[PDB]
Amino acid sequence: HNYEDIAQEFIDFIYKNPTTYHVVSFFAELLDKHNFKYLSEKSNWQDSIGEDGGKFYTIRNGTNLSAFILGKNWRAEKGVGVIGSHVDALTVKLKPVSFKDTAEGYGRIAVAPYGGTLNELWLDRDLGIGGRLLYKKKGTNEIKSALVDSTPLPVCRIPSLAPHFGKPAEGPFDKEDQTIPVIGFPTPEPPTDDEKKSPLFGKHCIHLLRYVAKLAGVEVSELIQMDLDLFDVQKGTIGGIGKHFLFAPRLDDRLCSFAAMIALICYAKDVNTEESDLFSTVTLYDNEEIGSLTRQGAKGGLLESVVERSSSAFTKKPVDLHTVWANSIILSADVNHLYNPNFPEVYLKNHFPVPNVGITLSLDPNGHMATDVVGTALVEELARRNGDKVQYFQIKNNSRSGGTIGPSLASQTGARTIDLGIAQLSMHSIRAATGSKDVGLGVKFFNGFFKHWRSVYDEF
Amino acid sequence: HNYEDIAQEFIDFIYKNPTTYHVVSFFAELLDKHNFKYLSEKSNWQDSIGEDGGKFYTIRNGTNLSAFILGKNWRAEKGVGVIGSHVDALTVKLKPVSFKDTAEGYGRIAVAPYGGTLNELWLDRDLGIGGRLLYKKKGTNEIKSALVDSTPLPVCRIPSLAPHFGKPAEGPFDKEDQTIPVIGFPTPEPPTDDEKKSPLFGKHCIHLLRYVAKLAGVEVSELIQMDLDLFDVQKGTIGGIGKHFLFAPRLDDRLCSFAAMIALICYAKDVNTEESDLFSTVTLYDNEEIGSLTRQGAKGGLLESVVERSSSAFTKKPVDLHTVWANSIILSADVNHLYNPNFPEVYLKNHFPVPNVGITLSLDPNGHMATDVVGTALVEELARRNGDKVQYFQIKNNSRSGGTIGPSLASQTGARTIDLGIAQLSMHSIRAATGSKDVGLGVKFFNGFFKHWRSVYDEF
Amino acid sequence: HNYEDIAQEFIDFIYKNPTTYHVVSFFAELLDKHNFKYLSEKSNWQDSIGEDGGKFYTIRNGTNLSAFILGKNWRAEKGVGVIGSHVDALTVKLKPVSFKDTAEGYGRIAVAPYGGTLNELWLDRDLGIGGRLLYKKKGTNEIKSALVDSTPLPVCRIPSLAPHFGKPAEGPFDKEDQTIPVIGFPTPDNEPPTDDEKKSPLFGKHCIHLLRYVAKLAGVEVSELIQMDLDLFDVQKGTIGGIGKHFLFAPRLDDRLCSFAAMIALICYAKDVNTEESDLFSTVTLYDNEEIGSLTRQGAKGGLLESVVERSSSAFTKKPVDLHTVWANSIILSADVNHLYNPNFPEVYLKNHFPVPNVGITLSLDPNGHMATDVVGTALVEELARRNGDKVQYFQIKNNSRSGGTIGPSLASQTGARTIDLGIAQLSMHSIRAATGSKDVGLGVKFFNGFFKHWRSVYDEF
Ligand SMILES: [Zn+2]
Ligand SMILES: [Zn+2]
Ligand SMILES: [Zn+2]
Ligand SMILES: [Zn+2]
Ligand SMILES: [Zn+2]
Ligand SMILES: [Zn+2]
């Protein structure tokens, strides 16, 4: 029943938080409810973090979050127990100017792919709109932001051409000229003088501006800018004749992000920082799907920043960060590939995971993963101590591998990093699948990590 | 308000009746409800239909239905007002033997495409299972039928391969080896001696047998055969930022079938068969998507059978069927193509329809449609009288045309036949779209047809 | 022993009746012997069929036959029990003008393929000639018909080119210029045409040697020959084969295998049927031209079956018969051979959906309209088999494969009756010499016999 319940919570989480902004906001609220104190990056933390340590979190760009627990008795030699995952997922972004003239009466919006989207899997899917709106209340100068979400209303859909037309209906399709979202077909109010005051007037259809303004509860004239996504509004579902699966969009990598954060929360419940000598954290990054080379991506170093700022404010004595990282363990948690029975030729025998068993170690000898022999032994020892099962995933020698933030974090910190994650089918599809038990199994494993990684690594 | 309500009824209709069997059963129930008397094809109608005529309907194969209204004062010269549509839709059929050995633990079922399915649009879609089961209660010899439907449970899904793997993940995909539905991943009850009594034991996984037996409320041993489909369980939805669209699966051709049937029922409410001099009917065919050459398809002649049997039982005097058909008008109602703004190059200027305007006339000079100059004039006159709008659809000279049952019905009866229908986007996709007002506009047009076609045709 | 005997009877049947004309003539003769009364299509049957019903058969074009048994107590609601098969088989037809000048002394005849013949399987095969001759006895105007058959003499052979010549000897070969039957190599001393022979409307259209030969076979004068429809076919007699005699090798199995099995079943069944007591209407209708689409008057689309049932029911009783009710209560078995699993091409056969030799009838299933078989029909055949102690196999194509067709969909659409496509499976369909199980002819007869005996009782359960 526990696994079923957490599976449902995950489904609701995915459904109610479609964009990276919503996901980060969701975790921030969860953290607040569990007494983690928010610290602003733009302020020095010397007086915010005392010698008793505590539970805190910070956010960068509204899409990069780091939650951490610092014990009163922590010292550099104890290192840091880290779980890094990414909260961005393949999606479709409205262009800076999404406005398009009507085509034979059809209303459409100009968009661009974020990652490998706008392909055949994105055709004929109900797409909602949502994201971040920047506005300036009339009469003021302060710029504020609001999050909007059309769910359950699918405002647009990219229409496939009927096969009846022949060759023109065969893919692949041009992402600029053919995979364009259709948003409506209006029939014969004109822009008001006040609406025309918006810096966005003309850059987006007045109907769209009025719609998002209404969702945010502000005036069109107050809209300053926006960063909106188009996403599948179909709610996730437990599937399979025996209910062995969970079908849902954007699993990569909110599946691991969710599991890691919930594990951190469950773990934190029994941790009193006044009697703890550990430093634990779950850091969630944006932009992994586009290379991670952005200030809000893994290469932006929020993790390193949090550890340095915290250790500096924490004690009056200098902290040797090189010693800290040398004694740390970073779990780069990113979903990997579940065996797909219909494509046996691309999976390496003895090196593929199956549903509802446990976390999957990502192994690669050519640098695609940071996992090493010691890290592998550590995870397997951990699992043995906690009653967890560990699976493997490595590509066939004649295949190719995707990447993760693992190597970046390992190189940037110098800390042993282990790439692993909850395996899923159809990675990067608009609607993927994993085991109905995998969310709970993932939480269990990550919870065990925070509880016992230090004692286990001591044996090495 | 009426348009919004009928649009919602249509959505519910599609969702609650996934297979052709369900659709026919739905209409039969609706007809019983509106006082149409069911007549079995296996019995002579001489003592079921008399001088007073009345409202009746019959069914063939459980997938071919004909509803008709015969007035006491009808005569051969009055002809027959007909609307013919098809109730079969592209789907996926379980094979005679759907059993497949588990593959690395994964449960899969052997299926075959009905029409052009099992393509990329069918990948990563939540698929439910349903259809007709034939069973024989223990200790008896009688064979009975039962309809089952897993909705909302999606028992399977055809998993796309992650793009990370390269070329192997690029379509098109083999319909036999790559697009196979995954139904589960079982963990370690063995078949019982009684379950093995089923003629289907071994032909389908015992898990699937137990599941459909449970849905039908019968024992596994009692199952002797089945005709099941796999279909999208995502309920339809009104979409577009201005709610101008309706997104739903299996629109072709249940959209016209529903509109025509509802129009008949609305029309019948005010028809007094004791006074009426008309003979009206809506006949729904199976197998249009596979050529119509089956006994339950248009070429099977149920329409002609209904008219001959009815006219024979109706009066003691001989009825000249050639005169009947010479004075008849057949509307071959099959969905046609809405202009898709992203593929302007395949639509003929001045010969394409748009959403929420009205019925679309299907025109073709090379025999793909039966529509002629007189039929076109008749529909346009009919529309002018009822306050309906009429659109056009014809292919570009350098394009390709789909087909309909139109030419078959016209040739088989000798009656002037007009091909038309409610236009839709993405015909044959697993999830298509049409205007949110189009179901209502369609009903309005067809209602007008039954009411005024005789008076209009008289002018010619 | 019974299976072995019937297997031999089948082999003899195939060997002694090479063309569609011979096959129909063979069955007509068998029906006559078993007291089935012949009825001409050209005369009204009102006075030929009485209320006592009876056993009859009719023929159209000499290549389309329908045999039926009508019970005195039959009524529309009882429907009709039908087995439909085709008697035409892939062959080679002499052209309207088969004459060809000698080539370096070689005599050849101009021919055309009927279906997919004249390929590599037809090369280096001993070919006999036979078929229908139309003639008019000297001094008269009446046109008569005669059937001829050169068997065992193979008058023709299409010679493969020795591989020594290289590329030119590699197929495929042009059906008009390369696959031409060689009929002889004459020498001076074949006499010149006599004045009487030149009187034949066929003189000049076919070499005099051929005209004299077929005239001799028929027992008429060359001058009396007016027209002809002749085939070239393999004269190699069928044989029981396999180290354990598990197989039967023979030409033209598609679809004379099912046609023979169905007719024998009908005759065996008819032996115990007394029309004075019976309330059934049973028939085996054999069609021509299935191999070319069936759209001819003698093919399935020509409607001989529908005609027989309408004409019979009309002559049978004074009361009106509702044909729609008749067909709604009927079951049609479209019996056409399907594919036996070929172990050397496992990649084209669908797992769990292919038949093997010597087991039983094979149900032909297809979800895209190639077969008329449906869920109720499948259940009916399986129930029917369980009752008669017959085994039922399955055949359906892989999703990425291709399917052939049958007359099934045509018969179902034309009548409106539930139709089931099935048949005796064979290897190498459309080859000049195919193969099936040595027990399959017998198993087929057994199944079809069971169909006529119990289909009505079984269909009642639905
Ligand atoms: Zn990814
Ligand atoms: Zn990822
Ligand atoms: Zn269609
Ligand atoms: Zn259609
Ligand atoms: Zn054939
Ligand atoms: Zn055949």
Curated annotation (Swiss-Prot), chains A, B:
Native species: Saccharomyces cerevisiae (strain ATCC 204508 / S288c)
GO molecular function, one term: metalloaminopeptidase activity
Subcellular location, record wording: Vacuole
Biological process, per Gene Ontology: cytoplasm to vacuole targeting by the Cvt pathway; proteolysis
Coiled-coil intervals, chain numbering: none
Recorded effect of pH on activity: Optimum pH is 7-8.5.
Catalysed reactions, semicolon-separated: Release of an N-terminal amino acid, preferably a neutral or hydrophobic one, from a polypeptide. Aminoacyl-arylamides are poor substrates
The protein, known as: Vacuolar aminopeptidase 1
Additional free-text comment from the UniProt record: Present with 5730 molecules/cell in log phase SD medium.
Binding site for substrate: H164, E288, D334, H337
Stated family: Belongs to the peptidase M18 family.
Residues that carry a glycan: N61, N64, N397
